[PDB]
Amino acid sequence: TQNLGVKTATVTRGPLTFAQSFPANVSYNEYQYAIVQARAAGFIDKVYPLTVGDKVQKGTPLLDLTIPDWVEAQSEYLLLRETGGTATQTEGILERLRLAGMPEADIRRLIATQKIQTRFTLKAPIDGVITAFDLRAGMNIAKDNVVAKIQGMDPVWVTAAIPESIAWLVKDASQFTLTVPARPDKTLTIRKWTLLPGVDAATRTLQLRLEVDNADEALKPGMNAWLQLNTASEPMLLIPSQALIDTGSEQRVITVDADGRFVPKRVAVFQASQGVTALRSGLAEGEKVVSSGLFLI
Ligand SMILES: [Ag+]
Numbered sequence: 001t002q003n004l005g006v007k008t009a010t011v012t013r014g015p016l017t018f019a020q021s022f023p024a025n026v027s028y029n030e031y032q033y034a035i036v037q038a039r040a041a042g043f044i045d046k047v048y049p050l051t052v053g054d055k056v057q058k059g060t061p062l063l064d065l066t067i068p069d070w071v072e073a074q075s076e077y078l079l080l081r082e083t084g085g086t087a088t089q090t091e092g093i094l095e096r097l098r099l100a101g102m103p104e105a106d107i108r109r110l111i112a113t114q115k116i117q118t119r120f121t122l123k124a125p126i127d128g129v130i131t132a133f134d135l136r137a138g139m140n141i142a143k144d145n146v147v148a149k150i151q152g153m154d155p156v157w158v159t160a161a162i163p164e165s166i167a168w169l170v171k172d173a174s175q176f177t178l179t180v181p182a183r184p185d186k187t188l189t190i191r192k193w194t195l196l197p198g199v200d201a202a203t204r205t206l207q208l209r210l211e212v213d214n215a216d217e218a219l220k221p222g223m224n225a226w227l228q229l230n231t232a233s234e235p236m237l238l239i240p241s242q243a244l245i246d247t248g249s250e251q252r253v254i255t256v257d258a259d260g261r262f263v264p265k266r267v268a269v270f271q272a273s274q275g276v277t278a279l280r281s282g283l284a285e286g287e288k289v290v291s292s293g294l295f296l297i
Contacts, residue, residue, distance in 0.1 A: 007292025024225035039101030052133035059124025160227035175230030189213035256288035
């Protein structure tokens with residue numbers, strides 16, 4: 001017999017979810033930078049109040065290079081304007097200067113002020129941080145030289161390493177939980193996600209690129225981060241773990257009959273996890289099973 005107090009569950013067919021944890025490295029994304037490089041070749045000036053580790057916005061100062069060749073060309077052009085000159089010829093000369101590297105705004109300014117144009121302070125393009133920033137004091141610059149570069153933070157990248165098989169299992173962003181030791185947030189969005197086929201033969205792991213959402217600012221490189229990644233399995237018959245009993249080779253449980261009448265069924269488990277058990281053999285889909293309750297022999 002089995003007096004009332006029950007509770008019930010019904011076998012259903014599904015995959016089992018396996019949760020795994022990996023350690024991510026927080027990194028600055030490569031494409032989100034800005035390289036301030038210089039057209040023409042030039043000497044440096046002023047050099048500003050910057051130290052290589054600073055916040056910058058729209059590049060608003062940075063430094064100034066005064067240049068030789070352009071000035072000579074401008075002077076020749078000015079002389080042509082003063083005398084009398086083919087307007088077209090003057091235009092061609094201007095075009096050559098523009099080609100050399102003249103900023104267009106600067107050329108317009110020179111035309112407006114018939115002032116030999118000579119000194120430009122260049123401003124960095126993006127609101128940003130600077131990755132490399134150390135040259136100073138009037139030095140030669142050439143061709144297109146790095147005036148250096150600026151790092152941006154709208155995005156961030158957290159890297160986790162996965163086994164190849166587990167990685168193939170991946171698919172969808174939802175089975176992704178990201179968390180951090182320093183600065184736990186309301187949470188962190190995962191905005192993009194990618195597997196870089198490059199197999200860390202050091203080990204047999206693929207590299208997972210994760211683009212975190214850095215719009216408010218609480219993110220840095222080499223901070224520490226845990227990627228709790230969710231996974232799954234070919235589908236199996238699933239019972240709600242609690243109702244299942246063995247303590248020996250006896251291994252199983254009770255089947256209802258809509259009659260409210262019980263019975264023993266000998267099931268095989270396969271695996272257990274997270275909160276449910278998956279049987280290899282034993283029960284049929286939809287069969288009823290019990291998840292709470294007690295009764296007497
Ligand atoms: Ag299975």
